[PDB]
Design a protein around this ligand. Structure first.
Ligand SMILES: [Zn+2]
Ligand SMILES: [Zn+2]
Lengths: 230, 116, 121, 50, 49, 105, 50, 179
């Protein structure tokens, strides 16, 4: 569950899972993609065309052939995609809104690989070399749990849990309530520049968005808006 | 033993094993490249169904500075001859049936590990 | 519930137990190493057995003993089930029951490389 | 208008069906403009406390 | 107070018995019961004690 | 108390300094910055006076404090004539205060 | 049905030491309610009583 | 039952801090940054992980853990809530500064002694008569806020005398002691 720091984007979770079963193919369940994409396709989309270079991100010791023959089966799987661009077309061909032109699809699969998956490592212009390391670490840690070299994580361990006190509980509200009022001052600048007159904000600032969203959720207990309280 | 991935030399991609159907030899050609290099292992895929693993290969020597790990003075090292040693069980998932102990010398620059 | 004399002795009740439990090859096998040994008398390995029995790729499969006996199986029946399950498209060349290692050898005879892997799974 | 009649009856269908079944799979639940879904005739006698 | 002594002695003999089962298994002499792994025959001997 | 004080002192000036500036025919800038907060007051036919929690409890009020932000409007158009008609302390809303925090009376 | 499980990494509480199968380290309460329970076995007695 | 819980008396939930003076410190030790590293040098080197982000590689993790810990025990760059976990068996140092991590204070134990010596008891008995308090025990480096992901590598003694005395050995490497 990757999250940045109280961003207006919520948490966004990858999944680098491995299939039951050739056998032993690793997939990836990126966000904003409906199907799943094998991982070497992602490492090529992030921009690593060579095969040794994906593997240096996944396997730090090339000297134990124990973990080499575990990622071969997925390395043979995507031998059909070899450059970055057909690789983006693979992921971009799967979105929620798949673009009708190819170029729309690569603009999609380049935007989800820079802001939707793994944001905490970075959402900048060039962070693929460290989203690549942190992805290869997720695969590597999966291969350790499958080779049996490391015990699986316990969902109940309190080290794996955070408590949301009255601070984040409220900064989760005050983001949505502060986006609603920028949607209000938007429409109010709109109905007013289009008459070509000039627009004023004192009347555009709807004060009853904060003052009443807070007071509502703190009164009923429903942590949301009143329109979607069930 | 095993086989590793042996990578191409031109494109640094993975070489497949391919039998040379004329001279009767085993090659490794590429998919992206046309690189043929001549094999030597004459073994392609191996598979340990027993999954026989030696744990002494996985033990790092850095365990000896673990405050939370029991210490004996009844098994001394063999390279150095220190008296202190830490000991632990396989500490691995997939431990088949063994509660065997492993020792590490608790003396820096040694990290000798052994099993009794 | 065991019927006759098997009901008393634990020895003759134990082979019933063997004749009912599911044993596949994975329970008795230890190491599966496919090879491209071209000339079957060449045998990239130390084995003088083929040279008494006489495709270039094999499946040296070395079995287990304390798993092969605790179910009481001989290589004749494995060799027979091994060609009866796949017919006459293969030619198993088993070891003897005097050697220390329990090795089988398969070879096809009649996309070819992966096929010994496909049938060994 | 021989084209709007189609939309008129699609919405008539939605209303007459969520009158007797408010929970449909994959269909928007008829809510009251307070924001709460309705209690159709099927819900008045569906489960416990029907 | 004689019963307290009888009890403390039983309990110390028991903590002592499980230490030897642990030694045996730590040196690989606890042979598995036919029908159980090692960690189950161990846990069974311990829970019996 | 520490969680709330940290919400008030950092997390509010963080939620509002990173929301992007809105624009819209020429278009404007409208940027938010530098928030402030006051102590709970009541009539802020009346006069602003501090509500004491026990008075807020007895009249069924809501012990809250009002929030102000300083918004610089930049509407810019043809002829390259922009004004940063900046609106100081613009009311945003009222934020309820946790009793015996650093911002309670 | 088992003894107290290894909830931390290879130990049941942080007081014990890694890989401790002994009786006290896995939940065997050896006091009585008249003598009272030691701190660790107060906790294990609660894990059980839950 | 079991879903609604309660804090224990001395649990503190950490409120959160910025990881930037840690990132800045670690940079000017002997780290090596993740983007200027040869992928062949991660094998024998512990990986550093600030707040879930793998930022760096370090070739010597017994000097970081001892420096990072000295530096919390003085309350200077690392605030007292930050928790540094060192996993020995896999080569990982994880540093958390974020919020919502529940922690609790533990006495510190150096060799077999506590650090809480009779001065602190006497100065602390004369609080409210001048101005000595709990924050001086934390700043002086006597108690520590250890939390649950870091509590998995402490070796904790329950009472201080009786578990840090001399018998047949139970551990003799305690690192904390309970209040
Ligand atoms: Zn090549
Ligand atoms: Zn040594």
């Amino acid at each position: 569950r990757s999250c940045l720091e109280n961003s207006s984007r919520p948490t966004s979770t990858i999944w680098v899972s491995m299939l039951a079963r050739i056998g032993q193919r690793i997939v990836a369940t990126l966000p904003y993609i409906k199907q799943e994409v094998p991982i070497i396709i992602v490492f090529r989309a992030l921009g690593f065309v060579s095969d040794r270079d994906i593997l240096e991100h996944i396997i730090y010791d090339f000297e134990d052939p124990e973990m080499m023959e575990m990622v071969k089966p997925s390395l043979d799987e995507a031998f059909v995609i070899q450059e970055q661009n057909v690789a983006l077309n693979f992921i971009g061909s799967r979105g929620a809104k798949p673009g009708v032109t190819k170029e729309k699809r690569i603009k999609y699969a380049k935007e989800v690989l820079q802001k939707e998956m793994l944001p905490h490592v970075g959402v900048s212009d060039f962070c693929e070399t460290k989203k690549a390391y942190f992805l290869g670490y997720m695969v590597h840690r999966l291969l350790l749990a499958a080779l049996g070299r490391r015990e699986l994580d316990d969902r109940d361990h309190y080290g794996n849990k955070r408590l949301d006190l009255a601070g984040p509980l409220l900064a989760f509200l005050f983001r949505g309530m502060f986006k609603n009022l920028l949607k209000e001052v938007r429409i109010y600048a709109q109905k007013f520049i289009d008459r070509g007159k000039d627009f004023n904000l004192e009347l555009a600032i709807k004060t009853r968005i904060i003052s009443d969203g807070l007071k509502y959720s703190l009164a009923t207990g429903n942590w949301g808006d009143q329109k979607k309280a069930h | 033993g095993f086989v590793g991935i042996r990578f191409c030399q031109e494109c640094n991609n993975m070489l497949y094993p391919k039998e040379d159907k004329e001279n009767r030899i085993l090659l490794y050609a590429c998919r992206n490249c046309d690189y043929q290099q001549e094999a030597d292992n004459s073994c392609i895929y191996v598979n340990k169904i027993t999954h026989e693993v030696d744990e002494l290969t996985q033990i790092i020597a850095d365990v000896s500075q673990d405050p939370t790990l029991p210490r004996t003075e009844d098994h001394p090292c063999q390279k150095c001859g220190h008296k202190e040693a830490v000991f632990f069980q396989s500490h691995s998932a997939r431990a088949e049936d063994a509660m065997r102990l492993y020792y590490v010398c608790t003396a820096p620059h040694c990290g000798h590990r052994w099993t009794e | 519930f065991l019927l006759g004399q098997s009901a008393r002795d634990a020895e003759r009740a134990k082979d019933i137990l063997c004749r009912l439990e599911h044993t596949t090859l994975r329970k008795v096998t230890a190491n599966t190493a496919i090879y491209y040994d071209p000339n079957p008398q060449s045998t990239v390995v130390a084995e003088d057995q083929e040279w008494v029995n006489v495709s270039p790729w094999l499946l040296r499969v070395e079995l287990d003993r304390k798993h092969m006996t605790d179910r009481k199986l001989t290589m004749e029946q494995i060799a027979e089930k091994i060609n009866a399950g796949f017919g006459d498209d293969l030619n198993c060349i088993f070891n003897d029951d005097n050697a220390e290692k329990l090795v089988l050898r398969i070879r096809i005879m009649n996309d070819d490389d992966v096929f010994l892997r496909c049938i060994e799974s | 208008a021989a084209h709007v009649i189609a939309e008129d009856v699609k919405l008539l269908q939605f209303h007459v069906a969520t009158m007797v079944d408010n929970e449909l799979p994959g269909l928007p639940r008829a809510m009251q403009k307070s924001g709460r879904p309705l209690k159709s005739l099927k819900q008045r006698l569906k489960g416990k406390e029907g | 107070s004689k019963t307290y002594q009888d009890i403390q002695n039983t309990i110390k003999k028991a903590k002592q018995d499980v230490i030897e089962v642990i030694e045996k298994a730590h040196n690989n002499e606890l042979e598995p019961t036919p029908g159980n792994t090692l960690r189950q025959t161990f846990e069974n001997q311990v829970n019996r004690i | 108390l520490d969680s709330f004080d940290e919400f008030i002192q950092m997390s509010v000036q963080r939620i509002v300094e990173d929301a992007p500036p809105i624009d819209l025919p020429p278009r404007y800038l409208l940027k938010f910055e530098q928030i402030y907060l006051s102590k709970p007051t009541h009539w802020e036919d009346g006069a602003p006076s501090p509500m004491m929690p026990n008075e807020a409890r007895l009249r069924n009020l809501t012990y809250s404090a009002p929030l102000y932000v300083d918004i610089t409007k930049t509407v810019i158009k043809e002829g390259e004539e922009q004004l940063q008609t900046q609106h100081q302390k613009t009311f945003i809303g009222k934020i309820p205060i946790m009793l015996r925090s650093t911002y309670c009376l | 049905g088992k003894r107290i499980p290894f909830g931390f990494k290879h130990r049941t509480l942080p007081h014990f030491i890694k890989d401790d199968y002994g009786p006290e380290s896995r939940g065997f309460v050896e006091n009585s309610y008249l003598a009272g329970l030691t701190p660790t076995e107060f906790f294990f007695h609660a894990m059980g009583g839950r | 039952v079991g879903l609604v819980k309660n804090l224990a008396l001395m649990a503190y939930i950490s409120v959160g801090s910025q990881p930037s003076p840690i990132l800045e410190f670690l940079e000017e030790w002997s780290m090596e940054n993740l983007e200027e590293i040869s992928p062949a040098a991660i094998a024998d080197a512990t990986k550093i992980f600030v707040n879930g982000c793998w930022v760096g590689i370090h070739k010597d993790p017994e000097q970081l853990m001892n420096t990072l810990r000295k530096l919390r025990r003085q309350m200077d760059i690392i605030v007292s809530e930050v928790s540094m976990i060192r996993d020995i068996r896999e080569r990982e140092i994880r540093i958390y500064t974020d919020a919502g991590r529940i922690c609790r204070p533990l006495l510190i134990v150096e060799k077999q002694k506590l650090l809480l010596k009779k001065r602190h008891i006497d100065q602390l008995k004369e609080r409210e008569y001048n101005n000595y308090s709990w924050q001086d025990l934390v700043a002086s480096g006597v108690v520590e806020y250890i939390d649950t992901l870091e509590e998995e590598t402490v070796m904790l003694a329950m009472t201080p005398d009786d578990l840090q005395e001399k018998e047949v050995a139970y551990c003799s490497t305690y690192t904390h002691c309970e209040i």
